[PDB]
């Protein structure tokens, strides 16, 4: 899913760039995951990115 950010509680906008979990495919903004830039997001994606529940369950 994309058209809701459960981290922000759904005040969705297209202006902030996004990243997704490799397992769940759910999208979230860079800022609600403390990622600074599009390049930091590309680095985080190349590292094999994870959503909020995937931190305890399957991190990296």
């Amino acid at each position: 899913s994309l058209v809701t950010c459960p981290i922000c509680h759904a005040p969705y906008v297209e202006e902030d760039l996004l990243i997704q979990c490799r397992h769940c495919e759910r999208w979230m903004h860079a800022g609600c995951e403390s990622l600074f830039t599009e390049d930091d997001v590309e680095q985080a994606a190349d590292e094999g990115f994870d959503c909020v529940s995937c931190q305890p369950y399957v991190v990296k």
Binding site: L2, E14, E15, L17, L18, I19, Q20, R22, E25, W27, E38, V41, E42, A45, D46, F49
Partner: peptide, 8 residues
């Protein structure tokens, strides 16, 4: 999707 996304 492609891990990263930006509109536009």
């Amino acid at each position: 999707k492609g891990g990263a996304k930006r509109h536009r």
